[PDB]
Design a protein around this nucleic acid. Structure first.
Ligand SMILES: [Mg+2]
Ligand SMILES: [Mg+2]
Length: 475
RNA sequence: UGGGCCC
RNA sequence: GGGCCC
């Protein structure tokens, strides 16, 4: 977005310095070009003269303004996508009860009982369990008074900036390109879940290209469903964005919320309101308070769904700005936030679409390396979605999600102290698709020191997961 | 850390 | 309570 004001206040909000990610035995074997993100201004691995505070907010390069015609076109696209979306999901979008918003429903997982509470509770030393009863599904006086203000639409808040402690390519670690989490207040997440939680539940349940959303998917079983779909098409594109989250313009966000979350679609009048509070935001980072116009905070409830929805509308908007007669049947797409796979039988020109995404403030680039522009003919077996390739399983004849070995090495090279055994078992569930030999190699530095699931046990587990039939057919 | 999915 | 993706 656009940074409009940078206040210096006396109250300092501390951020998590020093990584909790420790090198594992595998790090010495694989030596990956990956490492924990820089968390301190004077980190020894940082490039000379690089101030960490400056790089964090370098993504904020302006809140791009749209003309009336682009806004009317956008409204049209948001309405058209909203039509398809609500046609599939239905219109049972009435507010969730407090109990349901805390504990979740079918499709929506419960709120995390002991994550960050946000502001101003962070300045009071309070955990989430001090404000909200997660077992009973009830809230205390503080949250209830805040819910009263949100009912009245008078609620004001700030976002707590957190440095994302994560494994990153050493280039971005050296560039100081640490990603940040905008931690929102716990009552905000609660109310957003009350306003749009049922909608979010229905989205997860109905994931697939029909609604253009992979939010709620299980790549183990759904790679078959998505894989067969996109292979059916002449052209497939792996479209990359740069700072997709931050570059959502206030025009696009506002219109999207107005078109998708209308009361005629079953929503409470405040669904549109609570989401609109995400457009213009105040962020607290240490000594500085930074006011931003545009972009989406990451700690928001439904941030992935909002991003997914926007992604769908962007692609429709771009094509309609360049071509005539472009409808929702003209192409097919799946997304998960910024991650996107597009396909069509029309030889569409995504290189020509670049400026049309720029009118929304988005920069599209080919994922297929730094190759000279978007090209045609590419299939689903060439693209990457959710850091996973689409690869045919020799034996079963099903698509499987395959991660790059360099990434799997990176993941296995670092762990939070004491979580290493548990990490190995979950990552095994990812590594199984790389094949028996590569599976053996990835866990080779761990043999004798930990329990490593056999290749056979996870392969038979995956076979049953993707389909109960072929597992029984093997008998 | 939010919206998943997995143990 | 972890891990992955986003
Ligand atoms: Mg939560
Ligand atoms: Mg991609």
């Amino acid at each position: 977005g656009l940074i409009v004001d940078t206040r210096d206040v006396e109250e300092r909000v501390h951020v998590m310095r020093k990584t909790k990610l420790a090198p594992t035995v595998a790090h010495g074997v694989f030596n990956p070009e990956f490492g924990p993100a820089a968390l301190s201004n004077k980190d020894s691995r940082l490039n000379e003269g690089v101030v960490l505070d400056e790089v964090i907010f370098s993504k904020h390069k302006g809140d791009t303004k749209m003309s009336a015609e682009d806004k009317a076109l956008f409204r049209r696209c948001a309405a058209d996508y909203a039509s398809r979306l609500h046609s599939v999901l239905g219109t049972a979008n009435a507010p969730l009860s407090i109990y349901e918003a805390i504990k979740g429903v079918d499709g929506l997982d419960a709120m995390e009982p002991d994550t960050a509470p946000g502001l101003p509770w962070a300045l009071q030393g309070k955990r989430r369990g001090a404000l909200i009863d997660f077992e009973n599904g009830t809230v205390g006086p503080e949250v209830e008074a805040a819910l009263k203000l949100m009912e009245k639409r008078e609620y004001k808040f700030a976002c707590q900036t957190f440095l994302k402690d994560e494994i990153r390519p050493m280039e971005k670690v050296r560039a100081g390109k640490t990603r940040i989490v905008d931690v929102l207040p716990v009552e905000h997440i609660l109310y957003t879940r009350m306003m749009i939680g049922r909608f979010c539940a229905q989205m997860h349940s109905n994931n697939g290209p029909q609604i253009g959303s992979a939010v709620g998917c299980n790549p183990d079983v759904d790679w078959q469903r998505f894989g067969t779909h996109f292979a059916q098409y002449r052209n497939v594109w792996d479209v990359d964005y740069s700072a997709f989250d931050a570059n959502h313009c206030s025009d696009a966000m506002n219109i999207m919320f107005e078109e998708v979350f209308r009361t005629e679609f079953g929503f409470h009048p405040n669904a549109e309101w609570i989401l609109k509070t995400l457009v213009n935001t105040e962020h607290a980072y240490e000594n500085k308070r930074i006011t931003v116009e545009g972009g989406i905070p990451s700690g928001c409830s439904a941030t992935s769904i909002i991003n997914t929805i926007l992604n769908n509308i962007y692609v429709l908007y771009a094509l309609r700005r360049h071509y005539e007669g472009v409808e929702l049947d003209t192409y097919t797409m799946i997304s998960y936030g910024d991650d996107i796979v597009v396909a069509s039988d029309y030889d569409l020109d995504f290189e020509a679409l670049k400026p049309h995404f720029k009118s929304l403030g988005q920069t599209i680039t080919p994922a297929d390396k730094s190759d000279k522009g978007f090209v045609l003919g590419h299939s689903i077996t060439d693209v990457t979605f959710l850091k996973r390739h689409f690869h045919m399983d020799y034996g079963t004849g099903f698509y499987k999600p395959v991660m790059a070995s360099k990434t799997l090495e990176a993941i296995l090279s670092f762990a939070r102290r004491g979580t290493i055994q548990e990490k190995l078992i979950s990552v095994a569930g990812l590594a199984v698709h790389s094949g028996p030999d590569e599976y053996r190699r990835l866990f080779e530095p761990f043999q004798g020191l930990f329990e490593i699931p056999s290749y056979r046990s996870l392969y038979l587990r995956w076979v049953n997961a993707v389909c109960g039939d072929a597992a029984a057919l093997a008998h």
